[PDB]
Chain A
Amino acid sequence: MFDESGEPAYSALPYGSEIELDSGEAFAIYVDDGDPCISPTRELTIETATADSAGNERFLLKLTQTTSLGVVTTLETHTVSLAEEAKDDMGRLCYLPTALEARSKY
């Protein structure tokens, strides 16, 4: 879960249960695939990107996989915008839930 400032909070939930966002939290990102990250560690990286043509703000979301030994590999990258009406460099939508549902399998 992500605070308004942007700090992360970690937790876990049973598979049957549904996510409920506490007040004071903006958004949460979880793993759809039924894959525990115990032996292969999955890391999430956030960095800023150029603003949209219409003045909207967008950032880069990246996912990486690290083994126990220390070998780091890259899984996925996306451009995501918090604004409801935002567009990608290719013209696709950048709204976080819609983009994650469309072009992400993790």
Chain B
Amino acid sequence: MILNNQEWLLAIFKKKGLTPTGKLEFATIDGIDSALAQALNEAFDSQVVSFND
């Protein structure tokens, strides 16, 4: 117990401060097309034909 006169010192903590800057970064919509093109192929996969004709 750190006690001086009539006051107690209880705890000392640590904080993380954040100060912003003006710069910004963003993604592109270009890869969504390739993603959809790849995703469409899983519809035709895992399909079989038992008897040939």
Q: Give 8 pairs: A residue, B residue, CB < 8 Å, sorted on A.
A: A53-B5, A87-B5, A89-B5, A90-B5, A90-B6, A91-B5, A91-B6, A91-B7
How close is A20's CB to chain B, nearest CB, in angstroms? 37
Interface size on B, as a range, is under 10
Which residues in B have some Cβ–Cβ distance to A below 8 Å?
Answer: 4-7
A53 with B6: CB separation less than 8 A:
no
In the A-B complex, the 4 residue pairs with the smallest Cβ-Cβ separation, listed nearest first, are A91-B5, A90-B6, A91-B6, A89-B5
How close is A50's CB to chain B, nearest CB, in angstroms? 13
Rounded to whole angstroms, the CA-CA distance of A91 and B3 in the bound complex is 12
Tell me if A's interface is mostly helix, strand, loop or mixed: loop
Residues in B whose Cβ lies below 8 Å from that of A90: 5-6
Rounded to whole angstroms, the CA-CA distance of A6 and B5 in the bound complex is 30
Residues in A whose Cβ lies below 8 Å from that of B4: 53
Residues in A whose Cβ lies below 8 Å from that of B5: 53, 87-91
Rounded to whole angstroms, the CA-CA distance of A53 and B7 in the bound complex is 14
* Residues of A44-98 contacting chain B, CB below 8 A: 53, 87-91
How close is B3's CB to chain A, nearest CB, in angstroms? 11
Rounded to whole angstroms, the CA-CA distance of A24 and B7 in the bound complex is 41
Rounded to whole angstroms, the CA-CA distance of A65 and B7 in the bound complex is 36
Chain B residue, CB-CB nearest to A89: B5
